[PDB]
Design a protein around this ligand. Structure first.
Ligand SMILES: Cc1csc(NC(=O)C2CCN(C(=O)N(C)Cc3ccc(F)cc3)CC2)n1
Ligand SMILES: [Zn+2]
Length: 1333
């Protein structure tokens, strides 16, 4: 475009691109924090003379409506006045491509038609920070060759400029005559009057209405200094001094004029009130309301005789309305007609008409009409399985703990996982008492009996805690012990959980719960307090839904004001009607080309949505929900981010967030291919946020690209329309390919259901990539590179377009001084200064929001959870960050996983919720000038960056990245082991097919393969042992040896661990230790490390070494009473450690009186091709007198009933001789045995009783044999053993069997060693077994 500058009178200059009328304009520069409804906004007469800075960084998504259409009254149908009223517009990103069913044209076309200048590409947040609290900031949009001077339009009578010049009548023939004095009235005021039976006589600002006949009078505006409207003030003064008693209703300018006429004073506010999130309080009844405001002048708080304040601003204590003590005269400083904004104060129009209908009264007459004492509260933590629900982690319980501690309420927390991150807490988040018990009705009853709490929080531990609290309620246990449910009542909860009860409750307020395919899916997070104050804190739009695992953006992007405000209001109505006291999530389907919607569901407990919404906004939902449960109202709770304002507000976001689920694709489609984590990315364009989130999913992902990752090729036979219409693991790449193959966007939207707005942004990314591909290091301009970075291109992406390396591209970019900017997530779009340390990084800006004087220690997080990289690394993070804090070291945390506890800006000095790439970590490290980086405590992601960080100026703490590299290179590590005389299984990296075959024969079958391919001899019937350890200058100073239950196999990171060892020889232990001593010296280890070993009798073979903390670090730490991460962090930073009491190699800590077990929280089958495997995640860790009781306690802790009745036996035919003994053992403990016919017959022929059952695929073929499903449903089978079976005819049935157990919530054993452990433990052996601290 042509470019133009925004120049402020203080000297601030920002260059932007013109998208409106290309001429210069001068005016007052203002900002408004309201995000939605820019068409309604920019037609507000209040902006006359003003250049408006938009908080919402993404402007124009809905285009412009039909700007000439009129409604039945002769008013603009879709606008708030007869044209655009702003003098100009300043935005971060202008969407040239729009998509909305009411759009007729682009916002830029509209602006051009109206002659309004507008520029994009300017830092609207920086402009906000500059304008705020200055009173009047003059500025100008200036084009080259069109110089203009600063002018203050407030020095002229703007009221007169916008007022009607003659009397206009709307609602002709209606019964109630209302005179409206036009001080820049909005159209919606007139619509709301007429709807109520007014015939509205709209009169000029200076019309002498004083002797007119009317039933009521209304004054509304608008722009300008109310003091310049003396003829109006004098006329209103005449009314007030008369004996006229018609009701008077002032809106905004009305409030000021009515005040002045009464004898009050007005002033020009240092800090104006302009937003759609402005909290006010009715001073009379303490009720809070969220309002739309757009005023820069206010009434002085000293009011004249006969007048009282009606509303007050909750943030800044300014007047927000006045009322006469006896006459029906009142005004409000906000806009109850909204448009845009929250439809929460429309009842003021009802009040006005009520006053007219009586024969006199006050507005008070017709206006709408810590209490619980708790001394000890029981908080139900994150628990086990919930039948027909995915499996959840939810540690929000700890925020509840923190809230209770600030109110001097004693806390008891239940969490059965002894190594949970939730209980790894030592300050405000530590419960006074923790019980390590299952989250089940029996156990929670025992804690109630023991502790005698008077309150219970049941809505902050996921579905299982909820089901549990509800069951205690139903059985009378809560009544019996005097335990109050804090927050939403169980009666209200039951109404949301039962589909039918929910429908009936909704039908009472004329709302409703068929295919919603291709409807827009929008969700709101809502908080309601015990005083019936009810706010929306976040809203989200599903980009693409393929069970709650959608790609989501926040805020919603494609809604109009009408749609957004319609759903927002329904949310509030539904939440209040349901009796919510705390948080609630509500999900809508909205028809994509009308106003029709329906409610999909409500969730009256904390959820993945509420955790995402807290991360996206910085509003601490769980903490606030816990304060609400104590009956504290929103206005009386602090906004933790601002420090100076309350929880009674709706966040305004000057960035956009993108969340993407993390799919289970690491092992290498939808049948058993689930969401195992999530990422969230922040940007100030959609594109920036979007590419960043894609990269966050996995390091092989470059951004948005039509090329499959890992250099794979699209099939030659590809049917693209087919790929687009069914979920796949390559869906996003298929969309990119469709766009790039010139499939129309309309067709892509028809096939995918993704709104075309999003597809336009995707197309711009691909178009940028084409632009970049015709350029080179010499010809690419600064402007192009800047734009590419602003829409989320990485240096690596750019490098492939230009034919450069990544490093050369970074260098090139920094030579042009193109770098990103550190912004704060402040919850208020800069309305108030924040001192938050909750940060992101964007190219869309012109300043940083923080200083870089800390020079802190960086700690890198683990990225999205997935199989093998789970909650254990959150525990490691928490411990390492606390060690640093305890030693007085400033910390910088970087992570992008919104499910983590460690991304808590209250526990670290700077939290960057950012991409864990080399590029972004270097940006953050060098901008902060960090003193070092810890890459050892976040799993593989950070550790794999060791060497690239080290080569780019990063000080890595602890073990040299050069050593990490040697140890994790198979060829180098193996030659080091050869030289030290440490054994390992034979192995080869093979190029050719004839090489692979010759090796497989050189050492006998089988062999293991893994990604030029690595062959290793597979050793059969071996044990596996984990060594977790901490080195210091090459000396092992802490170690723990654990033993896998399962024989060494293809699964490791699926294995159940026993500590200390149970069936390992003493000689093998000595060899494990000796090998560990040698490895630590050979790699000069200073920090955490793990070595895995195969053991067979006395033969000990190293499998591999990971020179970083492993997932078993929490487990071994809690088991031995020594925090291995604490010790390692100390070593890595050079802090001294006393070794006298550590588990060194010469003096191990071997528990005597107990054994610990670590097992997966959730397991489920996966169909492959042909075979069936298990996947598992999460952790449960328990202690027991021995491994047998530990194991039973783990089973109860994961939410299972210990089997008693019947066992389904499924084994491969060749495994029969080995299994017969265990079968008899299980039978001799009183289990009835079931098996498929041939197995059943074989058992019976060996004198082990069994009952035959049908294979699922053959249930038709014989009505005489029982079905597995029926035997499970009726409780005959309460355990399924289903061991590996390579018979390909039954692979699918074995998958079905396994899926049935998992879905019915009964235990499923798929390994022989684990089956033997169970069999032994039930010989050996619910309440009795357990535990606590
Ligand atoms: C090895 C591995 C582990 S995880 C992984 N790849 C991913 O996680 C990708 C799969 C492709 N993918 C995808 O198709 N998505 C999420 C659909 C999508 C739809 C709309 C969007 F806006 C973005 C993504 C994203 C993540 N690869
Ligand atoms: Zn105000």
């Amino acid at each position: 475009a042509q470019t133009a500058h925004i120049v402020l009178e203080d000297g601030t200059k920002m260059k932007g691109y013109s998208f409106g009328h290309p001429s210069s304009v001068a005016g007052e520069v203002v900002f408004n924090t309201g995000l939605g409804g820019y068409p309604e906004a920019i037609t507000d007469p209040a902006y006359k003379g003003q250049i408006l800075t938009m908080a919402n960084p993404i402007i124009g998504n809905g285009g412009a409506p039909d700007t000439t259409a009129l409604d039945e009254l002769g008013l603009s149908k879709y606008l708030e006045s007869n044209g655009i009223k702003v003098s100009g517009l300043l935005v971060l990103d202008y969407s040239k491509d729009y998509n909305h069913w009411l759009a007729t044209k682009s916002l830029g076309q509209w602006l051009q038609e109206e002659k309004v200048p507008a520029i994009y590409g300017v830092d609207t947040r920086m402009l906000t920070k500059i304008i705020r609290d200055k009173g009047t900031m003059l500025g100008k949009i200036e084009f080259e060759g069109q110089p203009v001077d600063f002018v203050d339009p407030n020095k002229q009578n703007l009221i007169a400029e916008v007022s009607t010049k003659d009397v206009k009548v709307y609602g002709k023939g209606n019964p109630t005559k209302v005179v409206a004095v036009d001080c820049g009235i909005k159209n919606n005021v007139i619509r709301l009057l007429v709807k109520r039976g007014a015939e509205v006589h709209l009169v000029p600002w200076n019309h002498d209405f004083t002797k007119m006949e009317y039933d009521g009078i209304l004054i509304a505006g608008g722009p300008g200094n109310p003091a310049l409207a003396e003829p109006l003030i004098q006329n209103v003064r005449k009314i007030l001094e008369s004996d006229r008693k018609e009701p008077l209703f002032g809106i905004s300018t009305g409030n000021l004029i009515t005040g002045l006429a009464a004898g009050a004073k007005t002033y020009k506010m240092s800090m104006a009130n302009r937003g759609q999130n402005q909290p006010v309080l009715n001073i009379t009844n303490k009720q809070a309301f969220i309002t739309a405001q757009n005023h820069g002048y206010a009434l002085d708080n000293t009011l004249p005789a006969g007048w009282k304040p009606l509303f007050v601003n909750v943030n800044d204590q300014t007047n927000e309305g006045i009322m006469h003590e006896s006459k029906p005269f009142f005004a409000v400083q906000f806009h109850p007609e909204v448009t845009p904004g929250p439809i929460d104060t429309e009842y003021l129009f009802d009040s006005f008409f009520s006053l007219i209908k009586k024969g006199k009264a006050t507005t008070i007459t017709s206006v709408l009409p810590s209490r619980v004492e708790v001394s000890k509260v029981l908080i139900l933590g994150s628990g086990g399985l919930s039948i027909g629900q995915a499996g959840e982690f939810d540690y929000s319980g700890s925020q509840a703990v923190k809230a209770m501690k600030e109110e001097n309420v004693k806390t008891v927390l239940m969490n059965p996982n002894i190594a949970s991150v939730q209980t790894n807490e030592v300050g405000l988040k530590q419960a006074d008492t923790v019980y390590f018990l299952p989250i089940t009705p029996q156990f929670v009853t025992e804690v109630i009996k023991a502790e005698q709490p008077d309150g219970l929080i049941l809505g902050m531990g996921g579905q299982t805690a909820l089901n549990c609290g509800v069951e205690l309620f139903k059985r009378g246990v809560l009544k019996e012990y005097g335990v109050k449910v804090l927050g939403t009542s169980v009666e209200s909860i039951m109404a949301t959980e039962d589909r039918q009860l929910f429908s009936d409750k909704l039908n009472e307020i004329n709302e409703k719960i068929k295919s919603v395919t291709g409807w827009k899916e929008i969700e709101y997070e809502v908080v309601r307090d015990a005083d019936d104050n009810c706010v929306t804190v976040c809203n989200m739009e599903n980009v693409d839904a393929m069970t709650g695992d959608s790609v989501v953006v926040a805020p919603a992007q494609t809604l109009s004001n009408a749609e957004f405000q319609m759903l927002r209001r329904t949310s509030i109505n539904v939440v209040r009607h349901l009796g919510i006291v705390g948080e609630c999530n509500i999900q809508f389907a909205l028809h994509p080309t009308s106003m029709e919607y329906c409610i999909i569901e409500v969730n009256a407990r904390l959820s993945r949505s509420s955790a995402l919404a807290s991360k996206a906004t910085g509003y601490p939902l769980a903490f606030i929900a816990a304060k609400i449960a104590l009956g504290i109202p929103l206005p009386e709770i602090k906004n933790v981010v601002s420090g100076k304002t309350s929880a009674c507000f709706e966040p305004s976001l000057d960035y956009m967030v993108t969340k993407i689920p993390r799919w289970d694709l690491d092992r290498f489609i939808g049948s058993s291919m689930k969401s195992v984590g999530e990422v969230m990315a922040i940007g100030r364009t959609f594109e920036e946020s979007f590419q960043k989130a894609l990269r966050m999913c996995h390091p092989s992902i470059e951004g948005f690209t039509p090329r499959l990752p890992m250099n794979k090729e699209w099939p030659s036979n590809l049917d693209l329309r087919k790929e687009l219409s069914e979920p796949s693991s390559t869906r996003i790449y298929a969309i990119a390919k469709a766009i790039d193959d010139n499939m129309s966007l309309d067709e892509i939207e028809k096939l995918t259901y993704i709104d075309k707005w999003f597809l336009y942004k995707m197309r711009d990314i691909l178009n940028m990539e084409k632009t970049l591909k015709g350029l080179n290091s010499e010809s690419m301009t600064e402007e192009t590179l800047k734009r590419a970075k602003e829409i989320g291109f990485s240096d690596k992406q750019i490098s492939k377009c230009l034919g450069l390396t990544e490093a050369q591209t970074r260098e090139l970019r920094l030579k042009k001084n193109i770098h990103p900017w550190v912004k704060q997530i402040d919850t208020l779009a800069a309305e108030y200064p924040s001192v938050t340390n909750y940060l992101y990084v964007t190219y869309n800006g012109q300043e940083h929001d923080v200083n870089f004087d800390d020079h802190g220690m960086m700690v890198l997080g683990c990225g999205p959870y997935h199989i093998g990289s789970s909650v254990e690394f959150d525990w490691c993070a928490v411990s390492s960050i606390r060690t640093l804090r305890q030693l007085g070291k400033k910390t910088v945390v970087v992570n992008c996983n919104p499910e983590t506890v460690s991304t808590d800006f209250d526990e670290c000095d700077k939290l960057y919720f950012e991409e864990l790439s080399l590029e972004r970590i270097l940006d953050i490290y060098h901008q902060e000038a960090c003193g070092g980086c810890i890459i050892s405590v976040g799993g593989q992601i950070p550790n794999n960056l060791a060497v690239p960080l080290y080569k780019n100026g990063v000080k890595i703490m602890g073990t040299s990245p050069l050593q990490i590299d040697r140890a994790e290179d198979r060829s180098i590590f193996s030659a080091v082991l050869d030289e030290l005389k440490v054994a390992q299984a034979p192995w080869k990296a093979v190029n050719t097919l004839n090489e692979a075959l010759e090796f497989a024969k050189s050492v006998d079958y089988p062999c293991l393969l893994r990604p030029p391919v690595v062959l290793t001899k597979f050793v059969e019937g071996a044990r596996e042992v984990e060594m977790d350890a901490v080195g210091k200058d090459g000396r092992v100073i802490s170690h723990a040896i654990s033993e896998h239950v399962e024989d060494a196999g293809v699964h490791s990171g699926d294995a159940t661990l026993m500590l200390p060892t149970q069936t390992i020889s003493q000689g093998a232990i000595e060899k494990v230790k000796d090998a560990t001593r040698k490895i630590a010296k050979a790699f000069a280890i200073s920090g955490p490390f793990n070595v895995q070993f195969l053991v067979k009798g006395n033969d000990v073979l190293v499998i591999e070494c990971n020179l970083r903390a492993s997932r078993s670090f929490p487990f071994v730490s809690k088991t031995l009473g020594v925090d291995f991460i604490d010790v390692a962090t100390k070593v890595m930073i050079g802090e001294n450690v006393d070794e006298k009491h550590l588990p060194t190699l010469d003096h191990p800590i071997i528990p005597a009186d107990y054994v610990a077990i670590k097992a997966p929280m959730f397991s489920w089958p996966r169909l492959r091709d042909l075979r069936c495997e298990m996947a598992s995640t999460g952790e449960v860790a328990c202690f027991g007198e021995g491994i047998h009781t530990a194991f039973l306690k783990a089973m109860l802790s994961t939410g299972f009933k210990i089997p008693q009745k019947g066992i389904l036996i499924g084994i491969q035919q060749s495994f029969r001789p080995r299994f017969l003994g265990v079968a008899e053992q299980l039978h001799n403990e009183g289990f009835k045995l079931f098996a498929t016919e041939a197995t059943s017959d074989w058992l019976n022929a060996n004198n082990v009783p069994a009952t035959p059952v049908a294979w699922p695929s053959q249930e038709g073929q014989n009505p005489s044999l029982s079905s597995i499903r029926k035997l499970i449903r009726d409780g005959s089978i309460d355990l399924v053993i289903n061991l590996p079976n390579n018979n390909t005819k039954f692979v699918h049935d074995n998958y079905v069997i396994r899926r049935t157990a998992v879905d019915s919530g009964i235990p499923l054993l798929t390994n022989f060693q684990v089956t033997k452990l169970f069999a032994e433990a039930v010989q050996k052996s619910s309440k009795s077994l357990f535990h606590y601290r």
